[PDB]
Amino acid sequence: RHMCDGDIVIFNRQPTLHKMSMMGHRVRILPWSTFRLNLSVTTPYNADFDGDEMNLHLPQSLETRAEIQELAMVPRMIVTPQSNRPVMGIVQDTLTAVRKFTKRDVFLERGEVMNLLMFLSTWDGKVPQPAILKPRPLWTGKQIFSLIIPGHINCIRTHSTHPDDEDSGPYKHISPGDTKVVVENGELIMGILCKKSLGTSAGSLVHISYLEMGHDITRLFYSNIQTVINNWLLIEGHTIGIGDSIADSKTYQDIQNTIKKAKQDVIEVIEKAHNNELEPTPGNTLRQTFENQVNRILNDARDKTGSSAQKSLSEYNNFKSMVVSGAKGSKINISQVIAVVGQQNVEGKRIPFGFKHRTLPHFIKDDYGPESRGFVENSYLAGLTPTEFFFHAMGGREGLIDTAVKTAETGYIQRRLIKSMESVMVKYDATVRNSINQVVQLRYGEDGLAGESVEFQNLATLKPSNKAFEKKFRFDYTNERALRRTLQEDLVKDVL
């Protein structure tokens, strides 16, 4: 019979690198002629819908259908064995929208909450009491996400923009910036959810949800997050534009002043090298020392300009919204768009003298300046000069060449690895033997523990002082009052 809803299929993308490149899904019938799949499945597949086409296999027998359903369902491989961390994560658009959703200043009228709750599959039908009762019934976005979080799980994470000095002084439990993620009793207490909380990082919220709860519960957790945050995103809305790429005139003056200072700094370094007044660093030639100084000045200029540019985002710029959530982009991406592209590099160094001692026929011979050797002082907003545009093409061509050649050399590698270890398994005596029953390890991973159910932990016995170790672990029973405060009196006299 023709396949109906609920059927099991195998769903894989070439090249199948790891075991999450081939999953089992349940069939849903939709009209149009494409494979509609969910969003969080993108990350394990590395398929960005840019014309990507997928392969779908159907298990014909009934016995193999159960084999896939008990092994190859996507809830059962949320956590990878290679790095004991989740691989599903949250896609960019949900991640940016949920980062804005979980902010402290987010408030929802009764109707918008009343709409959002309809998309929770795991909702018991009880509307939570608003965080604001008077003057108006007003729910906080964190309350809505608290309904999303299933069961009773407890995690502590840090937001991407959490200041490192905040936990030192006061406010370490009441964060002024709401940059401390604290989930308690299955309820989101406080904090803003960046990629370090809902992403694929180890110890994230989804990873703990997979372990503390089951695997079907986490499946509902992923679906609930995507549905309700996208629906709230309709009311909120997220965009990007040129107003997100323009800094105020004061910042532009700062950028130009830094470049002019750095450009003049390189020139005075160059005139020092010409007059032999530059001294060679011990360990390299006077050329390499000169190249080091030029690289250091330009790298400092790029960093200072990038830092100064990323200090004028006004907290409403969408570039910062995407980078802070960690969904798409980085601080380098904002810096090059707004302030300065920076030095272009080929084979790890500056632009070589393709012509006779000049990179282009447009510069004078033996010109080691920033512009002549490939440094670009303009940004993508201002546009590149033709000499800089060609030098930018220099770097990009190197990137594509690396991408095109890496595939063949890397691709040969895993085939050698797999074919070398295509028969290494764990026998029923918990030992690791190859095809010819030769023991490789007495226990798998020298401990017999699978790579999915492990977490990063901290050994408290390691790195105290000797007195600190004794103070924290000895359980001094001689003190009276300490025993009185810690234990009940019947137990206190029992120990004493």
Binding site: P31, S33, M114, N115, L117, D124, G125
Partner: protein, 115 residues
């Protein structure tokens, strides 16, 4: 090829109920109203009106999928008041409001056309 026709956005088929009532079991006095072959163009207004009743505790609507023409309206009213009668009162209120707006628009057109 797999492109569905144009007429399934509003046309029902044999054996297809326009409205299906399913009494919710999670909380008392709650029902799910499944409207077939329809979209936001009625559900949004029904939700908005059901918010105006002071005895309705929950009233929302959603589309399971934009490619499937069906909506579900979940209505939870206070005990001693059925959700079904809330729904049928909201529909009558909308009919009354749209009718009133209709003759008022007629009157406005008449006032405009001869000054």
């Amino acid at each position: 090829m797999n492109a569905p026709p144009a007429f399934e956005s509003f046309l029902l088929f044999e054996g297809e109920k326009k409205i299906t009532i399913n009494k919710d079991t999670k909380v008392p006095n709650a029902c799910l109203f499944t409207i077939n072959k329809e979209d936001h163009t009625l559900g949004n207004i029904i939700k908005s009106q059901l918010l105006k009743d002071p005895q309705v505790l929950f009233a929302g609507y959603k589309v399971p999928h934009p490619l499937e023409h069906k909506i579900i309206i979940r209505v939870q009213t206070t005990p001693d008041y059925s959700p079904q009668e809330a729904f049928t009162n909201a529909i009558t209120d909308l009919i009354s409001e749209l009718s009133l707006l209709e003759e008022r628009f007629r009157v406005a057109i008449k006032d405009k056309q001869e000054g």
